[PDB]
Amino acid sequence: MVLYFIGLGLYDERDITVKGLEIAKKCDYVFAEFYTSLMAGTTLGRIQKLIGKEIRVMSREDVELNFENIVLPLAKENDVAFLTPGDPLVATTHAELRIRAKRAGVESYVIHAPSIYSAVGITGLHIYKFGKSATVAYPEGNWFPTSYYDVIKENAERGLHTLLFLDIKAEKRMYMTANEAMELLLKVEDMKKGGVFTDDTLVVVLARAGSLNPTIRAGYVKDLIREDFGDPPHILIVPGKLHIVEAEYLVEIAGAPREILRVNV
Amino acid sequence: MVLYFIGLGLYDERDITVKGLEIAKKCDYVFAEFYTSLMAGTTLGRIQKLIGKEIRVMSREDVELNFENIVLPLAKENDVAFLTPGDPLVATTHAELRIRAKRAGVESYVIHAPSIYSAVGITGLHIYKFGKSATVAYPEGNWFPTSYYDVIKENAERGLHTLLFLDIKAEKRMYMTANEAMELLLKVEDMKKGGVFTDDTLVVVLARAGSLNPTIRAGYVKDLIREDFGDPPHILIVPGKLHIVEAEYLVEIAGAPREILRVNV
Numbered sequence: 001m002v003l004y005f006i007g008l009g010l011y012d013e014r015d016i017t018v019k020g021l022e023i024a025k026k027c028d029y030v031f032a033e034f035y036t037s038l039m040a041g042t043t044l045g046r047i048q049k050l051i052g053k054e055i056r057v058m059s060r061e062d063v064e065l066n067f068e069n070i071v072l073p074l075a076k077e078n079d080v081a082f083l084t085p086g087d088p089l090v091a092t093t094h095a096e097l098r099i100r101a102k103r104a105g106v107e108s109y110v111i112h113a114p115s116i117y118s119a120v121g122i123t124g125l126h127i128y129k130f131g132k133s134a135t136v137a138y139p140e141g142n143w144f145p146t147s148y149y150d151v152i153k154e155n156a157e158r159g160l161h162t163l164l165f166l167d168i169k170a171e172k173r174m175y176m177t178a179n180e181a182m183e184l185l186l187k188v189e190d191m192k193k194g195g196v197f198t199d200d201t202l203v204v205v206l207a208r209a210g211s212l213n214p215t216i217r218a219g220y221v222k223d224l225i226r227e228d229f230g231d232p233p234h235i236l237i238v239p240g241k242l243h244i245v246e247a248e249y250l251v252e253i254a255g256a257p258r259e260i261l262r263v264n265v
Numbered sequence: 266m267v268l269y270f271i272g273l274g275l276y277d278e279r280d281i282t283v284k285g286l287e288i289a290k291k292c293d294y295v296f297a298e299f300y301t302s303l304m305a306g307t308t309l310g311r312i313q314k315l316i317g318k319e320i321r322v323m324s325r326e327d328v329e330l331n332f333e334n335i336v337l338p339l340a341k342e343n344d345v346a347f348l349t350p351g352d353p354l355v356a357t358t359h360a361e362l363r364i365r366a367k368r369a370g371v372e373s374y375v376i377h378a379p380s381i382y383s384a385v386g387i388t389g390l391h392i393y394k395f396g397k398s399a400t401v402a403y404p405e406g407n408w409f410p411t412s413y414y415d416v417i418k419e420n421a422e423r424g425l426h427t428l429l430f431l432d433i434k435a436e437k438r439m440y441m442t443a444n445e446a447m448e449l450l451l452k453v454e455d456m457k458k459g460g461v462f463t464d465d466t467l468v469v470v471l472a473r474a475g476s477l478n479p480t481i482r483a484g485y486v487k488d489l490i491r492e493d494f495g496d497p498p499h500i501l502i503v504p505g506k507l508h509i510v511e512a513e514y515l516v517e518i519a520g521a522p523r524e525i526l527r528v529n530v
């Protein structure tokens with residue numbers, strides 16, 4: 001009769017909360033999805049061992065089209081968990097899953113966990129200054145999507161930071177790197193020429209948030225576009241004008257060039 | 266000689282991540298602050314029992330003025346942890362503390378935890394649609410803060426949602442309720458008359474996120490301004506333009522008036 005939405009956190013199997021782990025261990029059935037994001041610092045095997053339950057992995061279609069026939073039936077007379085990377089209900093379409101639960105006469109509860117939305121705070125950029133967020137998608141065939149470029153434009157114009165998620169094809173396990181994201185953005189700039197993303201734009205790269213040894217780098221596109229940020233996933237941020245305190249953190253912690261202390265403040 | 270910034274999460278001691286607990290259990294000294302937020306479902310004793318350590322609680326002054334004198338000295342020869350509610354670097358000025366650690370020659374690591382910033386996902390509002398965030402501060406003497414009103418205005422103009430952190434004065438054990446925030450906003454509207462926040466404005470209230478039964482309510486200010494949302498902490502959210510599914514969730518899950526289902530596009 002109960003469905004638990006449980007977040008797995010940012011990087012490895014230890015990123016789940018004590019509450020989430022204990023509730024998971026008490027569930028009769030455990031489902032999970034790894035198409036929205038992938039726990040880069042662990043494996044399905046390590047997660048299964050930690051929880052001590054077999055985990056029924058679900059594809060995007062399994063969730064979006066058949067959540068009510070794969071998960072809810074069992075949740076009708078059993079305690080069931082639905083695990084997701086990060087914090088539950090962050091993925092755009094997940095909140096609607098609680099409506100499906102209600103319609104099926106199933107109670108649902110949310111067990112939160114760390115999300116990149118809040119973890120980006122490790123970049124030293126003030127959370128209140130982030131504006132609209134967006135995802136950088138790979139162009140394909142005749143389709144060249146660029147809305148993420150306009151998001152950056154509108155935020156920066158108002159002195160706000162722009163959090164950019166990078167493309168991911170979970171099944172094929174192919175991640176977009178910050179480097180690719182930058183090259184793509186320079187290409188969009190050459191097209192729209194809005195003076196939004198250029199070689200002189202200051203950017204911040206966060207790789208493997210959640211691990212004890214994450215890669216936090218800041219600098220100008222001209223110097224970071226070919227830098228090695230390590231293994232994915234990578235998150236790209238285009239900060240708005242900086243607070244001197246944000247700039248000092250980027251210089252002292254993220255190795256940003258002292259130049260930002262005068263140019264981007 | 267390491268310093269760990271470890272978040273404790275949204276509501277109770279079980280909101281800490283497994284990673285954070287295991288690392289906290291093995292630290293030589295443990296410090297913490299409980300003035301940046303309120304963890305309504307736990308006590309200092311419960312947290313201490315969980316990590317099996319005595320916790321040296323610090324005031325805002327101990328931290329902001331004496332962090333390098335109270336915490337860092339020990340972090341130079343021991344493994345020290347500094348615990349905080351939610352995520353340690355979200356809507357706090359704790360990030361600058363890492364710069365202090367660096368200057369004292371102390372390495373620091375950050376262990377994230379669920380934060381109110383991402384927990385907004387439980388309101389059904391698409392998290393990528395949130396714009397600039399703000400804090401509703403208690404007026405003091407002849408000083409009446411109003412900047413948060415302009416933030417709402419700016420976001421609303423762009424069709425973006427506005428997350429409003431609410432004031433807190435731990436030493437006075439004062440925690441601003443969503444009701445008090447609504448009253449202050451109506452007063453600012455009376456002054457600026459921008460048509461930004463009125464009795465007909467749709468708002469969302471999230472109280473005690475992290476608990477199994479948080480209060481999630483959506484409706485017009487005129488109807489919610491006097492509604493009892495339970496014990497603090499609370500956050501107030503002023504949505505921008507709603508997607509059909511955001512409206513459906515507010516109605517089905519947050520008990521919003523069915524009339525908001527009809528969205529003006």
Ligand SMILES: Nc1ncnc2c1ncn2[C@@H]1O[C@H](CSCC[C@H](N)C(=O)O)[C@@H](O)[C@H]1O
Nearest residue numbers: 302351352355380381430431473474498499
């Ligand atoms: N569990 C909770 N439920 C509702 N609001 C919360 C909350 N925890 C924090 N807040 C909101 O945030 C304010 C503190 S701001 C500090 C936030 C913290 N670092 C985090 O990551 O969550 C509170 O005054 C309140 O308005």
